[PDB]
Design an enzyme around this catalytic site. Structure first.
Site, short mmCIF file in Angstrom:
data_model
loop_
_atom_site.label_atom_id
_atom_site.label_comp_id
_atom_site.label_asym_id
_atom_site.label_seq_id
_atom_site.Cartn_x
_atom_site.Cartn_y
_atom_site.Cartn_z
N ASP A 61 0.84 -1.20 0.00
CA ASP A 61 0.00 0.00 0.00
C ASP A 61 0.89 1.26 0.00
O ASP A 61 2.11 1.17 0.07
CB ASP A 61 -0.99 -0.04 1.18
CG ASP A 61 -2.31 0.71 0.89
OD1 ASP A 61 -2.30 1.63 0.05
OD2 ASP A 61 -3.35 0.40 1.51
N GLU A 94 -10.39 7.19 5.35
CA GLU A 94 -9.31 6.78 6.25
C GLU A 94 -9.40 7.44 7.64
O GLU A 94 -10.50 7.57 8.18
CB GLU A 94 -7.94 6.99 5.59
CG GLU A 94 -7.79 6.26 4.23
CD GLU A 94 -6.41 6.42 3.60
OE1 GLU A 94 -6.30 6.96 2.47
OE2 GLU A 94 -5.42 6.03 4.24
#
Ligand SMILES: [Ca+2]
Ligand SMILES: [K+]
Ligand code: NA
Length: 622
Positions: free
Chosen positions: A289, A489
């Site tokens: 990621d 997020e």
């Protein structure tokens, strides 16, 4: 030791593909091998750099768009893709002609691209309980991705979320591993095609299942937090989605930001090699990621042997790729990354590119799947999304059967979310957080007010829009659209379950309408259940609409009768997350020992029910 099942049971390797890989690898230098493993991002990458290094892939991060142009024509996307493709087919500087590929995250459709169809976020898709729907959304998504000249998309997200305080709760289909397992393989085959003759052919894309593993089980739902669970729980609760995704032959797996019992997953050889590759039998490539390598012990932005040694095959280093490339080469030469490790990474990654057809297809702008610009935001896809919207809605309360509303009524539509597409779409929609989006960032989308207006007008009723709830003629009913502001997020991490705990702004609007004896239908936009006893008490009906995406008219389709006054669509959605009765039920999950929800997993009223919800306790914990 804990035994994990072998789950790569369908996809068989293609001998012709493997022969090519072995041939390619035998002639490649260390430098050419490492180049394949490094992934720059378009905000920082030049065409000259691509010609010089011949990187294995590059990323559409979604913040920039090709050539810096916020919005761009299909021809512009394809021109960029061609320039990068030709730079990588130019063996002049790096000594070899391996075609690169472009990748992109597909959070709910091709969601960082202006003009793309935006499907409901995963939580509402979970509510729909419809595996065929999921597969078709994957198919539509592959086409919209293909239309921008991109070969590789990141989807599905297979998190199983156990604490709704997490800012990424809406990206998960369910708190229940069985539901995620049912869904994951359908999204993989929708994007990639079924294992078989059509596998990775045509408009089919390379897919990535994310994230491995346990990011939905962090303590207190902290984003990138620490997942405290034994290995059997990691397997039985958090990995169920990977079982079906790997079985369906998903080509890539993305590693997770969180830690497991104190160790960052990106540096954990036990998880990424022994479990993922040896026991589960995943035969594809692992991608990291966004700068996730930097958080591994001993690593930084420009170096991470540990992650590569742990089993990461492609490194997402958007900005520091050049220094990372040279450092990684020196580490292989120093012998601290084995040549066998580099070989295996390149094998797994080339196995995906070659089998998808990177040597056999023409340059991007000339491929058959590039000739259809109408695919981006296609009417057929918006029709599909609208169906998903309808099936995602969960009716929590419908006292005295006030829903469905006669379309010929006089209706007032109020609340901040009434005509705000950015609120109905949520985060990962053209922009990251979604905060700065306005209605013009979503051409051909339809707000909830607009969808209602269209049908009420057709039926001869009257409708008025007023976010603050002001009216001239007193309406028969008020539809109040309220909810969370968009987030992505950690920006969405919360500590308190109560909706708008600091202001209670929406509640004041609801009470204002009740005090005027106006019947109230609340449409609640959110990425998760929240403690809303007070708002429920101020509502005659209350609908959990989650984050429905671009097709707001799906709401009108269900809440309103047709012009004849008959039901057009009934509710079908059922909760895939448990709804809290108290403001401190942080980890309220199906099958818990002490399970006392306001509305249980699987709950959902329909128009066939005649159930009233009584006034609820409004007491909050100290
Ligand atoms: Ca839960
Ligand atoms: K570090
Ligand atoms: Na090259």
């Amino acid at each position: 030791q804990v035994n994990w099942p072998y789950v790569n049971t369908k996809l068989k390797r293609d001998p012709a593909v493997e022969a090519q890989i072995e041939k390619l690898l035998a002639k490649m230098t260390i430098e050419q091998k490492v180049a394949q493993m490094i992934q720059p991002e378009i905000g920082y990458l030049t065409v000259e750099q691509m010609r010089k290094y011949g990187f294995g892939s590059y990323l559409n991060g979604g913040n920039t768009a090709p050539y810096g142009n916020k919005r761009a024509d299909q021809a512009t996307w394809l021109k960029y893709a061609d320039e990068m493709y030709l730079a990588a087919m130019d063996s002049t500087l790096d000594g070899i002609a391996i075609p690169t590929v472009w990748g992109t995250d597909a959070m709910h459709g091709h969601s960082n691209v202006y003009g793309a169809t935006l499907f409901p976020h995963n939580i509402g898709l979970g509510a729909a309980r419809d595996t065929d729907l999921i597969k078709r959304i994957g198919q539509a998504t592959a086409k919209e991705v293909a239309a921008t000249g991109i070969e590789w998309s990141f989807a599905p997200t297979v998190a199983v979320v156990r604490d709704d305080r997490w800012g990424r709760t809406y990206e998960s289909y369910s708190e229940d591993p069985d539901l995620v397992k049912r869904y994951a393989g359908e999204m993989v085959t929708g994007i990639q095609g079924d294992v078989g003759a059509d596998f990775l052919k045509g408009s089919n894309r390379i897919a990535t299942a994310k994230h491995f593993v346990g990011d939905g089980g962090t303590e207190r739902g902290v984003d990138r937090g620490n997942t405290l669970i034994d290995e059997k729980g990691l397997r039985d609760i958090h990995s169920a989605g990977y079982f079906s995704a790997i079985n369906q032959g998903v080509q890539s797996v993305m590693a997770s930001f969180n830690s497991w019992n104190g160790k960052r997953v990106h540096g954990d050889k036990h998880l990424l090699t022994d479990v993922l590759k040896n026991q589960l039998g995943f035969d594809g490539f692992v991608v990291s990621d966004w700068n996730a390598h930097k958080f591994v012990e001993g690593c930084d932005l420009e170096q991470c042997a540990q992650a590569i040694n742990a089993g990461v095959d492609v490194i997402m280093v958007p900005e520091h790729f050049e220094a990372f490339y040279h450092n990684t080469v020196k580490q292989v030469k120093a012998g601290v990354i084995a040549e066998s490790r580099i070989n295996d990474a390149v094998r797994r990654f080339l196995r995906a590119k070659i089998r998808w057809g990177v040597f056999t297809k023409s340059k991007p702008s000339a491929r058959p799947e590039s000739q259809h610009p109408q695919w981006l935001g296609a009417a057929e896809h918006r029709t599909l999304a609208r169906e998903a919207v309808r099936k995602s809605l969960v009716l929590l309360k419908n006292n005295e059967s006030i829903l469905p509303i006669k379309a010929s009524s006089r209706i007032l539509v109020a609340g901040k979310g009434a005509n705000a597409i950015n609120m109905q779409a949520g985060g990962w929609s053209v922009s990251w957080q979604g905060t700065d989006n306005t209605n013009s960032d979503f051409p051909n989308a339809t707000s909830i007010f607009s969808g209602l207006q269209s049908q009420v007008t057709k039926a001869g009723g009257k409708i008025t829009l007023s976010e603050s709830g002001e009216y001239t003629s007193k309406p028969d009913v008020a539809i109040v659209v309220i909810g969370e502001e968009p987030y992505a997020e950690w920006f969405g991490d919360i500590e308190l379950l109560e909706f708008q705990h600091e202001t209670k702004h929406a509640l004041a609007l609801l009470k204002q309408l009740k005090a005027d004896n106006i019947p109230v239908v609340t449409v609640f936009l959110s990425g998760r259940p929240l403690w809303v006893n007070k708002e429920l008490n101020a509502s005659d009906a209350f609908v959990a609409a989650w984050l429905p995406g671009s097709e707001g008219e799906g709401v009108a389709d269900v809440l309103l009768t047709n012009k004849q006054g008959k039901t057009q669509f009934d509710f079908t959605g059922k909760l895939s997350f448990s709804w809290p009765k108290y403001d401190d039920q942080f980890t309220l999950n199906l099958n818990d020992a002490d399970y006392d929800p306001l509305f249980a997993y699987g709950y959902g009223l329909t128009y066939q029910d005649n159930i009233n919800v009584p006034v609820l306790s409004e007491k909050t914990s100290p």
